[PDB]
Structures are given as C-alpha cells and as structure tokens.
C-alpha cells in the first residue's frame, strides 16, 4: 500500500557514487532528498542525502536486528516506512537544528519518460548521430575559444602601444613648447642682426619638429580605430560563445543519457565502442 519494496522506490537510486548524487541535487530547492547504497559497499547501509540550507546534508541510516533508524533506537521496520514517517514530519525531532520535511524527492522514474526509441537499434542509431553533433558542435566551440584568446592578446598589445604613443607625443610636444620658452631672449637679439640663415635654420628645426609631432599623432590616431575594430570583433566572439555554451550542455546532457541508458538495459559497451 505504501511500504513497498525498497527496489520499487522512486527515490532509491542504488549504487551511485557521491559525485553523481551531487550533480543531481545541484542548485535544487531546499528539502530535496534521495537514498542510495552506502559508499563502503557493505550490505544494508542506505545513506540519505538531504539538501537543506544550500548544503548537501548527508544522514546515515542504521540497520540492526532487522530494523532501521537514524539514532540509537531503530524503531522502524524498513527504509520505506522510515522515509515516509519523516516525509510527513520535519526532521526537527531527530535534530532540533534541522527543519525540513523531505518534500522533493529526486525520482529516477522522471528521467524514464523523457527518452524515446527504446529499441536496441534506434538507441544506437540516434545516439550515433548525437555524437556527430556533439563532436562537431564541441569542436566548433573550441575553435572559437582560440580566436577569443588570440583576439584578446592582440587587443592588449594594441592598448600598450597607445600608452607608448601618448608618452611619445607628450615628449615631442613639450620640446616644442620648450622651443619658444628658450626662443624668447635670443630671438630679439637674432632679429636685430639681419641673418636670414638663423631665422630660417631655427624654423628649419622647428618646421621639422612640427612634421614629427603631426606624424606621430597620425600614427596614434589610425591605431586607435584599429583597436576599436578589434574591440568590436572581440565582443562578437564573446556573443557567439555565450549562445553556443548552453547548446553544448543541452547536447551533452541528452547525449550521455542515451549512452548511460544503453548499458542499463543489458547492453555491453564493446559494441557501442564502434558505433561511436
């Protein structure tokens, strides 16, 4: 009626390592739980993992003299009845600082009615085509990563060049400004004597300096727009990666479900080795 066999239990998951249980309780609501065989592999241990307060609480079930329970008094006939007892009353009884009522079990039957083509050939055929999508899609992401990282280095290299240009410009322009400062007292005396060469030659250096100053600023000016194009192309690569990533998770998650599913229904993975 309620206390059916532990095998025919939605929450009981058998022998799944702790790592698998973590991926199945990750970012789930407070009160999620599932049961599995203790990690030691000894018979009749049945660790209970509960998700309370962001953390994965891990309460152990003791089995002595054909009885089960958390604390010393194992006043319970079987795991199913113990779970159902605490599935209706909060665990504050066992632990005063533990207030959750085993609300959302992680049922293994829910995963069952999401798959299709239960036969042995369609699974391999459908699974084979996902792998083609997975490898081609996965490699697609990896190639973009190379552009994203290679693009990042070029942007940083250009940015440092801009700083160097700024320093160079300030050095050049400051000298020009220093030109007049020093060319204030000698200029009057030079003007008095009608020496065309001194006026022209002084302007000759000054004229050359203006070309250098102007030429340098042009170099920085052009390089900046080159960076902006790189910066723009950089963001675009970021957009593609973000819109590709969830596809990889979705494809890989469904892809592995079938690969794991093939083993469950009495199929040896040697044949799946060549199916790919």
């Amino acid at each position: 009626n309620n206390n059916m066999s532990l095998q025919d239990a939605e929450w009981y998951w058998g022998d799944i390592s702790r790592e698998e249980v973590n991926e199945k309780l990750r970012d789930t609501a407070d009160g999620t739980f599932l049961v599995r065989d203790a990690s030691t592999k000894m018979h009749g241990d049945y660790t209970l993992t509960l998700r309370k307060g962001g953390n994965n609480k891990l309460i152990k079930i003791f089995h002595r003299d054909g009885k089960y329970g958390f604390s010393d008094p194992l006043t319970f006939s079987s795991v199913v009845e113990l779970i159902n007892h605490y599935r209706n009353e909060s665990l504050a009884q066992y632990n005063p600082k533990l207030d959750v009522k085993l609300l959302y079990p992680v049922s293994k039957y829910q995963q069952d009615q999401v798959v299709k083509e239960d036969n042995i050939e369609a699974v391999g055929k459908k699974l084979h085509e996902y792998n083609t999508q997975f490898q081609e899609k996965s490699r697609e992401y990896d190639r973009l990563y190379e552009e994203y990282t290679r693009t990042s280095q070029e942007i940083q290299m250009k940015r440092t060049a801009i700083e160097a240009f700024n320093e160079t410009i300030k050095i050049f322009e400051e000298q020009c400004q220093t030109q007049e400062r020093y060319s204030k007292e000698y200029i009057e005396k030079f003007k008095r004597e009608g020496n065309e060469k001194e006026i022209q030659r002084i302007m000759h250096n000054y004229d050359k300096l203006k070309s250098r100053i102007s030429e340098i600023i042009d170099s920085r000016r052009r390089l900046e727009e080159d960076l902006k194009k790189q910066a723009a192309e950089y963001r675009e690569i970021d957009k593609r990666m973000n819109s590709i990533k969830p596809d990889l998770i979705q494809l890989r998650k469904t892809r592995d479900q079938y690969l794991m599913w093939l083993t469950q229904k009495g199929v040896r993975q040697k044949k799946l080795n060549e199916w790919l």
Binding site: I59, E167, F172, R201, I202, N242
Partner: protein, 977 residues
C-alpha cells in the same frame, strides 16, 4: 616586437633623433651596440652645426631619457647599455638634467626586467592595501638580510650554497647494508699549483662522519680553518655540520653504487667569490568604531545596473544576478537571486535579503555572485549558463565590514566550468576595465563596523560554555582521508566531544569541518580550542591551508606548524603547492607569505625556485598583481642573485623569440631550411652572447658554459622542441658529466608533467624508505612561462621504438639488453629492469596517466626503465596495465612461458607491496592534488577530479578488498596472469 616596435630585425645603423634642451632637433646614425656614452658624445659633437649652443656648455649633467616598449619613460642613467638592448618603442632621444638617486632606479630597471613589468606601475596603484603591503613587507626583508649577517662570511656562504642535506640522519636498512661494515670509500682531489694538476686520494671512512673530520684525516694521507669540501662537477659544498651520508649527493652514490669523489677547496677562495650585499630601503618605505556584534540586523545587499553583458537579444531570453554568502567553498546561507530582466536593460534595483544576521558573519566570509542567462524554452526546459563572476570580501584587510557603493568588474567564466557561482575564485575586481561591470551598495550602519578583537571573542567563549570507552570512533574518523564523507551524526559527534579531541591532535581537519561558521557562538569556542591545540605534523597542517579552511586563526595555526617543523628539505619538495595556496589567501599581507618570503631570502635554493614558480604565472591577470608585488619584494632584497636571474630571463627570451619564429611564421618549410635558419640565428654574436655562461633554470648548481652548436638540432616530434647542448665550465667536469643537454619546449603545457614528476619522486621515496628498491627516474621539468618550459635529458637512453627499429618481433628488446651488458652483470640489468618496471606499473595505474606506447617509454643501456611525456592524468579503474609481451620476456629472462615463471611471480610480489605502501600514505597524495585546484590545470578543476585517485587506491574498501581490486585489474588488463 624586437628592438623597435613592429620590426624585430634591427639594422646596424638607424636614424635616431635627439631632443636637445634648447629645442633643437638633431638626427644621428649609430650602431646597434653603440653604448649610451658614445651616442651622447657624438650627439653633442654635432650641435655645433645647429642654431643655439649657449645652453649645453658640456656633455655631462644629462641622463638621456627615452620611452620604452612597456609604455613607460626611462631615465637611462646606466650609460653603458648598448642601444640594441634598450627595447625602445620608437627611435628618439631626449636630454635632461639628472634627477633622482640613480641608485634606487638603476636597480628598479633590473628589478622590473626580471619581474617582466615596470616597477613604476605599482606606484600608480591607489589601493590602500597594495601600498601597505609594499611598505610593511620590508620588515621581513630587513630581518632576512640581517640574519644573513650574524656570524661571519660563513653566514653569507650558507645563503648562497645551502647544504643539500636530507631530513634523516638515520639510514634505511637496505641501503645501510650496501656499506661494507658501515664504511664508504670516497675519492678526494687536490689541485696543485704548478699548472693546476690534479691529485686523487682514495679514502675509507664511516658513513656518519662530519665533513670537518673527513677533511682533516684526508690531510694525513697527504703527508682546519680552510679547505671546505666541494662536489666535483656541479656547485655543491659541504659547509654545515652533518654526517657525510646525510647529504643528498653522498646518499645517492651509496644507492647507485658509485664512487663519491669530492674536491678540496681553500676556504678563502670561496669567500672571495662572495659579493658584498647591501639592501637599501626603497623610497616608498618612508611614506566612532562600533563592534560587529552590536548590529541587530540581517545581511542586506542592493544590486544596481550592470553596465554591459555580451549576449544576443534573441538566443537568450532574460538575465539575472545570482549571489550567495560563502565561507570557503560552502554557503553560509541559501543563495538568493534577482528578478529576470530582458538582456537589454540590466537594471535590478533590488535589495537582496540574506538569512544570516550581521553578528553571525565569520571573519572570512565572502560574497560570491555571477550574471547568469536563463533560456526557459524547449517546451519543458530552462537551462542556466553563467556569463561572468566576481567575489567580494565582506571585511577589508583592516577588519572593517565594507559599506557604501562599490563597482565590481566581472571575470570570464573558466573554460570547462559549468556551475553558476565560482566561490573558488580570486576575490577582487577585473583589472581590465572594458569588461562587464556590476554596481552594488552595502547598507550603512551610521558608523564603521569593525570585527571584534580576540579579547572580546575569548570572553564570548568560556562564558556560554570524563573519558569515553567508545573513543575508538574518534580514532576511526581521524584515519579517514580528507575527501571521505562525514555524516550529520559524525559532525554532531565530533563537536559534542570536542574537548576530548585534543588527545587526538590529528583530528583537527575533521573537527573544523563539523562546526557551524554562521553561528558566532560555536565559532568563538573553536577559537579558544585552536589557541591551545597541540602541534601537528607539517604534512597534516599543510592541508589546513587549501581552500576548505579560510579562517585566519586556523590558517595562522597551520603556518606556526610549518615554521617549527618544515625542514628546508621538505619545503623544497612541497614548494610547488605552497605557492599555489597563496592564491587562496584572503588578503595581500598574510602569515604564509611572510613565512615563504623569509625562507626564500635565507636559502638561495628556495629563492631560485620561489622566483621561477611565481614568475611562471605572471601571465595570469588574476594573480599578476599579487605575485608581481611579491616578486618585487624578493628581487629587491634577494642580494646579488638578481644578476644571475637576469641572465636566465634574458636567455629564455632569446629562445622564446627564436622558437616563435620557427613555429609561428614559417612552420611550413622543410626541416633542412628550418635547420639552416636555426644555425644562422644561433650563430649571431648577440644570441651566442646571451646563451652562454649562465646558470641553468632546472638546477642552479649546474652552470652552462659554451654552446655546442654542432649538436643542437630541432626535434622532429611534438611542436618541434629544441635540443640544446652546453658544456661544464669547471675543470673537473669529466667526473660528473661533460655536457648538459636540455629540451626547450614552447607550445605545450608543462605543469601537468611537473606535478606528475613530483608525485613520482614522492612515491619512490616512500618505497625506498619502507623496504623496496623500485628505482624510478623523476627527471627535471620546469615551466618558465605560458606553455613554455625546460626538460632535462637522460644520457644514454633510447625509446622502445628506437630499439625495435634498429633490432631488425618480441625478443628484440631482451636481446638488446643482452647485447649491451654481457657477462655476470647481465643479472643486474634484468634485476634493474624489473624493479623499475614494477614501480611504473603501480605509479601509472594509481594516477591514471595517458596511455603509453613505444614512443614515450625509454630504457637506459644499464637496463633501467622510465616514462616520458605524461600528457594528461586522471582523465582524457578505467586504466589497464601498461605491461605487454615485450617486457614480460625480459622479466622472465627470455623464457617462452612468461606468466607461470618464478621470476614473474616475484615481479607481482613487489607490485602488491608497492601498491599497499602507497595506499597507506593516501592522505599525502590527496592533499598534493587538493592544493592545486585553483592552479588552472584543465583536468584538476574541482574535488570531483581528485575522486579518481580515491577509486584506484580503493580508499573506501578494506585493505584486503583493495588488494583484490588491484589483482583483478592487473590480470584483466593482461587477459590473465
């Protein structure tokens, strides 16, 4: 890149324009090697051809400033440097009156060339914590330097030539038996003044004789205050008083059955080489509060606009900000979210509420958050994907609970990481300012809230606060591995029995995990226990430093166990890991960094590798500033070693530039043209000048001399590595070896290989210490940058593929060993091939390294076997045995019936004894991997990956069930045996 921006090739003469003080523009044509002194000379002897000459009046009183490629202005006091190696951004020069000390910033140029970035950059950092570290960390620099001047020049020598001793005066029995009645025969060489001729003095002495009496009695056979002992070949000295067998060099000779021949050196000859060290303090060194526990309020944080997120307005529906208070890796409360909003207007004017009170916040609390994109499609699916992350400390380094507005620049999501938050991540803002930005705002409590001092905490404890027969459960928990599961009953059991735990000191890592950190009542009681806890072994206190234990008092206690127990021998072994747990440190000024830095500045072996381990991670923008500040402190006070570290850095750049040209621009040419390119490039005077007469990064005691260009080819494998050959400068090179070969690899990650070889060396040390002589070969490997590194070369070794190709089958390998060493020695070859082949079957299986084949498995002529190119480990019970039919024939000495031979069953006997020996020390191997999770290695990103080793060691099963698990794997992979 190159001498000038854009063009790496440097024409000998270039038009260089000067900026004279008056305002006169002049151009000069100079040489690549034209030093600054000459250029200024010729520069000033051409102003006579220009308008104004009345200001110069002389050539001195100028500094010859210019602009460097790093985009910073350099004053160029050091007039000696040739124009070639100035790294000028653009060819142009300016003349100014000298300003500054000229001593603090002739050094700041050498400091900033080794670190790889200008020292002036730390001056523009306005962070109050960055500038307090630069000033306060100089206390350790003074004490370390002062300690180096305590007794004599002798204290100076101990810094430069640290005794390479072992932490075990007592010898393992199996090696002690190698001595004939507890005595060892050594050869002593004395150099004679006429023509510097050599003498040989064979000598027999007890193993436990200090170097002092070895020298004295060696004089008797010759027929005090001088004549220190030295190792022929490399630069190793026996200065400190230890038993002669204590030293690493002497012990190995005993193991390998070699004659330990040494040299006698006049004491004042070594002291003369010692340079005078002067550590001058840098310029910068001279430059209402309510307690947290009186704030009756809950934690509240407000999110505001996020500047920009790179998403597509169609492939993604909405975005939200996911936050959560964390203490280490575990949440202190339940994660909170913000309302989904369109990915066009990320505003979020929300006030997130957290289920934790302000007074309950632990000191090491952090606020992790990320920007996630919710899809919410596919009929009945809603998949989340993070777009950026960022963590914030809730208390600044001064113990002040942050408050007010704050702008945080988010980081990219790490490759292969799929969880929404990244609590295992560096706290701080992204240095790059063109990334997503998120404005927060922490509520204001009308004051500055400071975390309560220890005296207040100690009172909260001891205020709210016999033996047990079933204390065998405490011993049961203590022996469990770090990653083992602890249940709610065990956590509640340890805490209740906390006061009786101090009789089990090694129970601390478990007792700290069974404490509620979001409850100041329990935490204040843990502080009062950690204060009186007994000391624990360094190999256990060294796991209180990884990411699981962020509390400053717990991490401070661990570093007090390292100080008083960690010997300089073990620090040199676990240094790769102690550097990595510097990235988990809460703030810049730790108690660990002060301990690590003091060791580096007091021991030049640790200093050399301390430098290269930090310097090899400066490309990471996440830890570039933290490690860059630390490298500057070391380089400032490291002594004269900065001149040796500058030659190694310069030599490695010449090789990186050379290799980039080969593998980047013209990779598609034939090898002969590629080979002819190398010889012309390596034959240039500058390249030959930078690549000679420097210490080797792999072993600072090996000094590399003239380069043997004839036998420096380009490997045809991998990414075309570089096989380079050098020579031993010292006269007695033939006694150690004549050439240092080194593979320079640029292109593949070497930090997977450099941790595998560290684990192999630790295994081989466990087996030797116990009863076994499984001789492994953990050659040298060092990563010096971003996917560039150095690999030693093992002399006289051929890959299994080479022996097969030149052998003509399956008896070829066994015949080849027979050919090389015939006679009575043949037994040792088969005995050594078996001991070495047994170790690499166990080490390969436990770590699950990539699959071996004939190309990456080598064998020395003597018979020893070793592996190379450990591509990946732990990824790619799911790894069979590497052994095959070729090696079985050698094991059984050619017998066709290999499985059922007496020899083979002996091979299996030491495969089991080896596996059970490592299984006992699984605690050490779970930490060495667990301290590298933030290291960034692709296959070691989470505690999930370290679960593979917990499976191949059968840590959950019983000692007997694990042994059966190994036997099943051994036989199954070989289809019976």
């Amino acid at each position: 890149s190159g001498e000038l921006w854009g063009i790496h090739l440097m024409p000998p003469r270039i038009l260089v324009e000067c900026l004279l003080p008056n305002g006169m523009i002049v151009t000069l044509e100079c040489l690549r090697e034209a030093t600054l002194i000459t250029i200024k000379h010729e520069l000033f002897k051409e102003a006579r051809k220009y308008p104004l000459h009345q200001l110069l009046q002389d050539e001195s009183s100028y500094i010859f400033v210019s602009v460097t490629q790093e985009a910073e202005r350099e004053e160029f006091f050091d007039e000696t440097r040739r124009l070639c190696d100035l790294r000028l951004f653009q060819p142009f020069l300016k003349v100014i009156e000298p300003v500054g000390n000229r001593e603090e910033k002739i050094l700041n140029r050498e400091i900033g060339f080794a670190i790889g970035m200008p020292v002036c950059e730390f001056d523009m950092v306005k962070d109050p914590e960055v500038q307090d570290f630069r000033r306060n960390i100089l206390n350790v620099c003074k004490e370390a330097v002062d300690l180096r001047d305590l007794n004599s020049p002798h204290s100076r020598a101990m810094y430069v030539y640290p005794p390479n001793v072992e932490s075990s005066p007592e010898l393992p029995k199996h090696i002690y038996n190698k001595l004939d009645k507890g005595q060892i025969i050594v050869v002593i060489w004395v150099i004679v003044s006429p023509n510097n001729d050599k003498q040989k003095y064979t000598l027999k002495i007890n193993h436990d004789c200090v170097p002092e009496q070895v020298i004295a009695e060696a004089i008797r056979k010759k027929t005090q205050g001088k004549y220190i002992l030295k190792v022929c070949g490399c630069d190793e000295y026996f200065l400190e008083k230890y038993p002669l067998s204590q030293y690493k060099y002497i012990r190995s000779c005993i193991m390998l059955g070699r004659m330990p021949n040494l040299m006698l050196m006049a004491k004042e000859s070594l002291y003369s080489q010692l340079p005078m060290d002067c550590f001058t303090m840098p310029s910068y060194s001279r430059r209402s509060t309510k307690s947290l526990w009186v704030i009756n309020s809950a934690l509240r944080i407000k999110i505001l606009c996020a500047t920009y997120v790179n998403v597509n307005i169609r492939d993604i529906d909405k975005i939200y900000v996911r936050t959560g208070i964390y203490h280490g890796g575990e949440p202190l409360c339940d994660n909170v979210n913000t309302q989904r909003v369109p990915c066009s207007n990320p505003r979020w004017n929300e006030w997130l509420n957290y289920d934790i009170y302000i007074p309950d916040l632990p000191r090491a609390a952090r606020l992790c958050l990320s920007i996630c994109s919710v899809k919410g499609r596919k009929g009945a699916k809603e998949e989340h994907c993070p777009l950026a992350w960022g963590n914030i400390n809730l208390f600044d380094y001064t113990d002040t609970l942050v408050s007010g507005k704050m702008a945080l620049n988010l980081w990219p999501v790490p490759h292969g990481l799929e969880d929404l938050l990244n609590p295992i991540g560096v706290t701080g803002s992204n240095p790059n300012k063109e990334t997503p930005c998120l404005e927060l705002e922490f509520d204001w409590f009308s004051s500055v809230v400071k975390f309560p001092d220890m005296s207040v905490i100690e009172e909260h404890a001891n205020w709210s606060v016999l033996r047990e027969n079933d204390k065998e459960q405490l011993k049961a928990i203590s022996t469990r591995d770090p990653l083992s599961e602890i249940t709610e009953q065990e956590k509640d059991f340890l805490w209740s029995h906390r006061h009786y735990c101090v009789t089990i000191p090694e129970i601390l890592p478990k007792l700290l995990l069974s404490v509620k950190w979001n409850s100041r009542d329990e935490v204040a009681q843990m502080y009062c226990l950690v204060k009186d806890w007994p000391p624990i072994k360094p190999e256990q206190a060294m796991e209180l430093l990884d990411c699981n234990y962020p509390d400053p008092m717990v991490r401070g206690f661990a570093v007090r166990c390292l100080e008083k127990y960690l010997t300089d021998d073990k620090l040199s072994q676990y240094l790769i890991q102690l550097v990595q747990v510097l990235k988990y440190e809460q703030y810049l000024d730790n108690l660990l960094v002060r301990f690590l830095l003091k060791k580096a500045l007091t021991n030049q072996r640790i200093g050399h590798f301390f430098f290269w381990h930090l310097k090899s991670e400066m490309h990471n923008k996440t830890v570039s500033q933290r490690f860059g500040l630390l490298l500057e402190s070391y380089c400032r006070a490291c002594g004269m070693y900065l001149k040796h570290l500058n030659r190694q850095v310069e030599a490695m750049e010449k090789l990186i530039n050379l290799t980039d040209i080969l593998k980047q621009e013209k990779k598609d040419e034939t090898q002969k043209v590629q080979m002819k390119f190398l010889v012309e490039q390596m034959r240039r005077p500058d390249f030959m000048d930078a690549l000679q007469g420097f210490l080797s990064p792999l072993n600072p005691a090996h000094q590399l001399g003239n380069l043997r260009l004839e036998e420096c080819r380009i490997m045809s494998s991998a990414k075309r590595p570089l096989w380079l050959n050098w020579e031993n400068p010292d006269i007695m090179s033939e006694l150690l070896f004549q050439n240092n070969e080194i593979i320079f690899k640029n292109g593949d990650d070497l930090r997977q290989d450099m941790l595998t070889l560290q684990i192999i060396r630790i295994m081989e040390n466990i087996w030797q210490n116990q009863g076994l002589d499984l001789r492994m070969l953990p050659y040298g490997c060092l990563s010096i940058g971003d996917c560039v590194g150095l690999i030693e070369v093992v002399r006289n070794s051929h890959t299994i593929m080479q022996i097969q190709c030149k052998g003509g089958n399956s008896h070829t390998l066994h015949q080849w060993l027979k050919d090389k060493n015939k006679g009575e020695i043949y037994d040792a070859a088969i005995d050594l091939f078996t001991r070495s082949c047994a170790g690499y079957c166990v080490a390969t299986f436990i770590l699950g390294i990539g699959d071996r084949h004939n190309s990456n498995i080598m064998v020395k002529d003597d018979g020893q076997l070793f592996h190379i190119d450990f591509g990946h480990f732990l990824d790619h019970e799911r790894v069979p045995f590497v052994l095959t039919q070729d090696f079985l024939i050698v094991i059984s000495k050619g017998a066709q019936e290999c499985t059922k031979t007496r020899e083979f069953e002996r091979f299996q006997e030491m495969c089991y004894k080896a596996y059970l020996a490592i299984r006992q020390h699984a605690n050490l191997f779970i930490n060495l991997f667990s301290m590298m999770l933030g290291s960034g290695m692709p296959e070691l990103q989470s505690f999930d990956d370290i679960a593979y080793i917990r499976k191949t060691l059968a840590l959950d099963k019983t000692e007997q069930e694990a042994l059966e698990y190994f036997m099943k794997q051994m036989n199954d992979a070989h289809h019976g045996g």
